[PDB]
Write a protein that binds this ligand. Structure first.
Ligand code: ICS
Ligand code: CLF
Ligand code: CLF
Ligand code: FE
Ligand code: FE
Lengths: 522, 478, 522
């Protein structure tokens, strides 16, 4: 039954006695489920170290991974460019999933097209699919550019993107001067960040490889900024703000900030501001190119060094105090601009918040996961805060990245209990947080289930989740936050210290039991 | 408003397409004309989507793993292939269930083989067998395993049926292979068909020789209800209040046991005809179980369906049905009395998947609103025949609408509310038009039954009458 | 006992068995405590309607007020001026308390002095204290201006600030030209915001009243901005940013943003950037003066309208969508600068966030409290969001403000279930949230105890607290948040939606009990 004055959604409508009785009758009558004693025993078994050893002996089964396929990152990189349509050569279900994922993370329209390849395309190869798709896309949506990525289905059958695009141009399906950069993005190699790398390398090679003769390094007195796979608009904004404050002329290649943050004013804009083709063409004339996330921009680094002849600095991601300082120092060295007093004041204020919150931050234990550069920067910042990153997980990491993170942890006394895991999924991390309980775990929304599991063991075993990373689905407008620079460091520090304080407040809210520590001042 | 106006709008929006695209898209846009039940009324469906048009359809894997097989609780569904398809589909659908996740329930979880380059080059059958071994090791209380193929599996020629048979014989476990490669078919509908065929071939006949289960003259099985936000539970409480015994529930809060118990049921109540009609027809042919459609959207459709269902049984069931209707009348009467004045005379446009574009019209018109446009992504001509009676005269019908077509239709019709999925939600919210998600119920729900109608009315009033829509225009602009 | 590896602070040290036994023995032997049944009965009685009527019949007792005394606001106003020392003429305990309060809220050094009037000064007056204190303060801390407030002790005995300062100057204790503005701030009148008003009026009258002959309205082509009692640095920052983006010449008088956000770089700056004496002297030449908080700037408005001949606009606090629009439109009308495209885009993005989060925000019930202008703006924004501000409390409000808020509520359909309370403290609000339970309550840290009380009645009766306002003591670096403008509206919206989602996630975390609604996507 329902009351019109107080309408109940699924929670807590299905907690009513009639619904409870109906569900109990269904369970005891037809579900044939195991007795609650067996379920409880097996759950307790899953929280032990024997189950942890069995879990970590896995070699063929992946349970709750933390990564995606390459064309997702390829689509994001394509969106980073001005009036550019992402075009995935392959099956339409992949594009539907990409759009749904990005829509749920960003709560913004995401534009992407497919050529809808089918059984016949799997037999004959999707050449007519590409011709008709390019014609239809340019006619219907009128993009200045079409950036072509691949679906694993087109990668298995070995479709030739270059020949297909060339034949589409020869047969008048698209004009010859129309920019159609392409990239092979196999879903069985790497992850989404690899797809971002491949798509950016393809676009840069399209716009620069044949025009390399008349380019002089440092002619336009600019610095090329390549951000990589970034899902925080605040990171683009903070990089641009810091570089404009320094008086440095910059070119942010693949800037999707405007298209992913269009205003609501009764009008829908398919295309917003992005990296124009003029900037892409004039990029080899820059003084140097800085890769914000160098651990998934290897192919881009190779291309930029070999072809543009840019001496790409060995820079870490500008996350936290030390690495933001190193980034700013390198930018000042490259561009010749001194660091202004505004950035110095911002750094001083970040240090002020660090000293203010060090008492509550010190000694805390964190299990974190995410992308390689983001995870490394978070580990560095936690080490700067006196925190212990006990469990470090990166599904899409490699051996060299693990070596770099191990060297970072060794240089600090707070990484003594740390352990980096690569190639591990979130079920492994569930086992880890059950057997070596941390204070908090930092990651995307997929960690919430882990938290639930811990709370089921007991209130004293619950490991709360702090949502920093991609994708965040159960919270709103967290994609507008910042993780780079002193601004991002301030936001991260505030989030961590306030999560600790909420946990302490909740644990001490019991009157005449634990409320003696329910302090007003903390 | 006028049929000629709608036809002119169709011809105007079709102008930008090339000749082939325009010719193909012409057959998929129509103006509704009741008493017409055929593919004659310029409506062709279940065809290949035009490349490069930014469609909305999914894939066969989405129709099989994400719709039919996923909501089964005590079963592990392995996305055979690269990471990707399995990750984007994890916990995307709100098929509610009761269970201890990770121990005896696995709907939320994501099991995959995570294909690498070596698995593409050398195949992935031995990897699949090892994966089944590890699944048995780490998840003892699972009651079955289903493998869902992705595009490379069908491309590289991997024999998953032999592995499934061998491992099922070895472990005495029900291992169901599903060849739901994404490139198969044109949309999720072929995924529905393949999943239904797998259910028939590997699960349904498991207890044909058994006679332990005790039957009852009032045995019904809900099929096609995936418990989106608790819809299946809300319908099941109504059915059981009538005196019936819901033995099986496909597939939202469903287990493999009740899928095997379905052949013992007297009557099969189909909610989603589009996805479960194959299994309904097979069960009617083999076990002789009659199946009937029902609609629990809105009190009018709910009462009609309850009376029709009770008509198939003795007089006691019909008396109990009348008792239930009388008991629930005051609640939905109060809901409609509260919410109809705030929603009366509002125009709604819908674009949903298999049958929701037609099943929800009764609830909307029961609140005082008119549906001025509807369409499907993957429905067949049977669904269009069924919906032509439901739609009002001179109303727009669209099949596999592209982004540009739906954008222009919304620009010209100017509806007060749009009910669709997540991929067009923010597009239409930018336009300043109230939008409601008709796939996930905007994370609200349920929408079935009388309680569902109350929640639906509250949500419609909340979205349609929100002050934010009145503030889209800056005061210093005209 | 303490494990050296895992050291336990008071929580959870005092949950040990030995401590529990010792505490139980002490309570049972020497406390003469009421039986737990009597305590439970009394508490259940306190959470009832009869107790609510008894509590609201109070006329002499105040329990848990939400307001401070005038000299606190006077000190905050004085801190906003360049190289200015706040000087409270009276007893030192007041200044110690003011400094502790502001230190705990801002986590920043707060400089204020007292003349340490004692029993002897209480009997004979504090003119000698004034002379000695002014001379000592100028000699030691070297300010460019000393702003004098009063303690209730000096206000009762009628100490003449003007005569005392004039005698100090005429006897050579301070230079005759040194600026010593003064204000009478009785603690038994109004509240801290009234003290801010009094101090600003005193400073303006000190710098402008005598030199009114050569002043012409609009000469400097600027708009004066009077921010009132503000404790969010982001509010000053956003006002300056919006005015600068619009290309408007502005003079923000009493700017404490720099002195309350000093960088930590190994050097202590007692004074940072503030409003200069030249700005205060040139203020009458401005086109107009805008009061950000008009409900506690009555004396300032009267002085500005009567002396400077500025026609102060009738603008509300720029909080939310509509009022920020009116503020920007009025600034454009006064200054002639068109509203730029950046502010239009920011408003559009705020509208987009509102549209994205309306489903979760709609219908929520909020109790709330704070200062008059802040409460008014929060109620307006909540009505814009579709929420229901059921309990509106303002201890330092008046009948005119109550009428204004009632008119605001009656203009919206979401104000039907709203009641405004003036002269009520947080015990009244505790009764209200027990009787007419709201979904959340928005206020300062003092509401945490109320939340604790609700949790004692049961987990289903708990009313969570959202910390927006002053003072915030149990969280870190929340004073850097923004409340005014589109940026503040976005911040408040994000806080509210994510609080709702956190509560929903907590309520649905029980496995096999309520986890069917533990949705990954929300
Ligand atoms: S299964 Fe089908 S698209 Fe029948 S694939 Fe789709 S949870 Fe739709 S119109 Mo999403 S044939 Fe169900 C459907 Fe309908 S996922 Fe749900 S809402 S009633
Ligand atoms: S149509 Fe469907 S969702 Fe697409 S792949 Fe094919 S089964 Fe799967 Fe998969 S990993 Fe990524 S998302 Fe694809 S490119 Fe391959
Ligand atoms: S020395 Fe001590 S703390 Fe000071 S007043 Fe005197 S008893 Fe009290 Fe009170 S209300 Fe405010 S804080 Fe004062 S100005 Fe009066
Ligand atoms: Fe949005
Ligand atoms: Fe500080």
């Amino acid at each position: 039954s329902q009351q019109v004055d107080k309408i109940k959604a699924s929670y807590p409508l299905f907690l009513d006695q009639d619904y409870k009785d109906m569900l109990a009758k269904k369970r005891d009558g037809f579900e044939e489920k195991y007795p609650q004693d067996k379920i409880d025993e097996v759950f307790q078994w899953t929280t032990t170290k024997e189950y942890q050893e069995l879990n970590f002996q896995r070699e063929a089964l992946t349970v709750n991974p933390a990564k995606a396929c390459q064309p997702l990152g390829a689509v994001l990189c394509a969106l980073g460019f001005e009036k550019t349509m992402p075009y995935v050569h392959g099956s339409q279900g992949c594009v539907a999933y990409f759009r749904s994922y990005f829509n749920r993370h960003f709560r913004e329209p995401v534009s992407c097209v497919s050529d809808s390849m089918t059984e016949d395309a799997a037999v004959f190869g999707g050449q007519q699919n590409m011709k008709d798709g390019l014609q239809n896309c340019k006619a219907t949506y009128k993009p200045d550019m079409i950036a072509v990525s691949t679906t694993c289905m087109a990668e298995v059958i070995g479709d030739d993107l270059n020949a297909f695009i060339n034949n589409s141009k020869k047969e008048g399906f698209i004009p010859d001067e129309f920019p159609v950069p392409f990239a092979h993005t196999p879903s069985f190699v790497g992850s989404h960040v690899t797809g971002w790398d491949n798509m950016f390398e393809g676009i840069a090679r399209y716009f620069t490889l044949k025009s390399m003769d008349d380019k002089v390094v440092g002619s336009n007195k600019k610095i090329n900024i390549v951000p990589g796979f970034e899902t925080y608009l605040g990171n683009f904004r903070v990089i641009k703000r810091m570089l404009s404050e320094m008086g440095v002329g910059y070119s942010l290649l693949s800037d999707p900030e405007e298209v992913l943050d269009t205003p609501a004013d009764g009008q829908f804009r398919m295309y917003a501001g992005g990296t124009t083709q003029e900037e892409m063409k004039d990029a080899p004339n820059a003084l140097n190119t800085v890769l914000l996330q160098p651990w998934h921009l290897e192919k881009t680094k190779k291309f930029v060094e070999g072809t543009w002849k840019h001496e790409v600095p060995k820079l870490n991601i500008p996350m936290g105090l030390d690495w933001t300082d190193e980034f700013l120092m390198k930018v000042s060295e490259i561009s010749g601009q001194p660091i202004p007093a505004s950035l110095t004041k911002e750094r001083g204020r970040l240090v002020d918040m660090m000293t203010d919150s060090h008492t509550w931050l010190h000694g805390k234990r964190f299990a974190l996961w995410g992308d390689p550069d983001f995870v490394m920067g978070l580990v560095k910042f936690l080490l700067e805060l006196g925190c212990e990153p006990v469990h470090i997980l990166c599904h899409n990491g490699n051996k060299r990245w693990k070596k770099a993170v191990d060297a970072i942890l060794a240089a600090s006394p707070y990484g003594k209990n740390a352990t980096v895991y690569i190639g591990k999924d979130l079920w492994h991390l569930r086992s880890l947080v059950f057997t070596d309980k941390p204070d908090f775990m930092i990651g995307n929304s997929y960690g919430k289930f882990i938290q639930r599991d811990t709370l089921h063991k007991g209130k004293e075993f619950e490991v709360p989740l702090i949502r920093i990373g991609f994708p965040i689905f159960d919270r709103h407008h967290l994609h507008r936050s910042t993780t780079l620079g002193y601004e991002g460091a301030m936001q991260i520090l505030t989030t961590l210290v306030n999560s600790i304080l909420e946990r302490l407040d909740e644990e001490t809210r019991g009157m005449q039991a634990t409320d003696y520590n329910h302090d007003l001042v903390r | 408003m006028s049929r000629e106006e709608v036809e002119s709008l169709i011809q105007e929006v079709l102008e930008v397409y090339p000749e082939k695209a325009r010719k193909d898209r012409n057959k998929h846009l129509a103006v509704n004309d009741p008493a017409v039940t055929q593919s004659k009324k310029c409506i062709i469906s279940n065809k290949k989507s035009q490349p490069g048009l930014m469609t909305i359809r999914g894939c066969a894997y989405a129709g099989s793993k994400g719709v039919v097989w996923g909501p089964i609780k005590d079963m592990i569904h392995i996305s055979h292939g690269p990471v990707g398809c399995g990750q984007y589909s994890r916990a995307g659908r709100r098929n509610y269930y009761i269970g201890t996740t990770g121990v005896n329930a696995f709907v939320t979880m994501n099991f995959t083989s995570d294909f690498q380059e070596k698995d593409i080059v050398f195949g992935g059958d031995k990897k699949l067998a090892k994966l089944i071994d590890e699944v048995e090791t780490l998840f003892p209380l699972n009651k079955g395993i289903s493998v869902q193929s992705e595009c490379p599996i069908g491309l590289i020629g991997d024999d998953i049926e032999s592995v499934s048979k061998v491992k099922g014989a070895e472990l005495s476990k029900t291992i169901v292979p599903v060849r739901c490669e994404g490139f198969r078919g044109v949309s999720q509908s072929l995924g529905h068909h393949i999943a239904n065929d797998a259910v028939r071939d590997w699960v349904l006949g498991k207890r044909d020789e058994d006679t332990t289960f005790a039957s009852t003259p009032y045995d019904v099985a809900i099929i096609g209800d995936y418990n989106i936000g608790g819809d299946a539970w809300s319908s099941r409480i109504l059915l059981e209040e009538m005196g019936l015994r819901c033995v099986a529930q496909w597939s939202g809060d469903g287990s493999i046991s009740e899928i095997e118990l379905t052949p013992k049921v007297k009557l099969n109540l189909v909610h989603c005809y589009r996805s479960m009609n194959y299994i309904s027809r097979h069960m009617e042919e083999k076990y002789g179980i009659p199946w009937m459609e029902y609609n629990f959207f809105g009190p009018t459709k709910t009462i009609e369906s309850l009376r029709a269902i009770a008509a198939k049984f003795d007089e006691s069931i019909q008396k109990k049905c009348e008792e239930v209707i009388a008991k629930y009348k005051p609640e939905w009467e109060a809901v409609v009395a509260k919410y109809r004045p705030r929603l009366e005379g509002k125009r709604v446009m819908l674009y949903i998947g298999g049958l929701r574009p037609r099943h929800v019209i009764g609830a909307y018109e029961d609140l005082g609103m008119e549906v001025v446009g509807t369409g499907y992504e993957f429905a067949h001509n049977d669904d269009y025949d069924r919906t032509m009676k439901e739609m009002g005269d001179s109303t727009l019908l669209y099949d596999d609408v592209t982004g540009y077509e739906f954008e222009e239709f919304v620009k010209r019709i100017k509806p007060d509310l749009i009910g669709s999925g997540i991929k067009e939600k923010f597009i239409f919210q930018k336009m300043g038009i109230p939008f409601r998600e008709m796939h996930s119920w905007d994370y609200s729900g349920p929408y079935h039954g009388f309680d569902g109608f109350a929640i639906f009315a509250r949500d419609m009033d909340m979205t349609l009458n929100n002050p934010c829509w009145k503030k889209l225009q800056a005061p210093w602009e005209a």
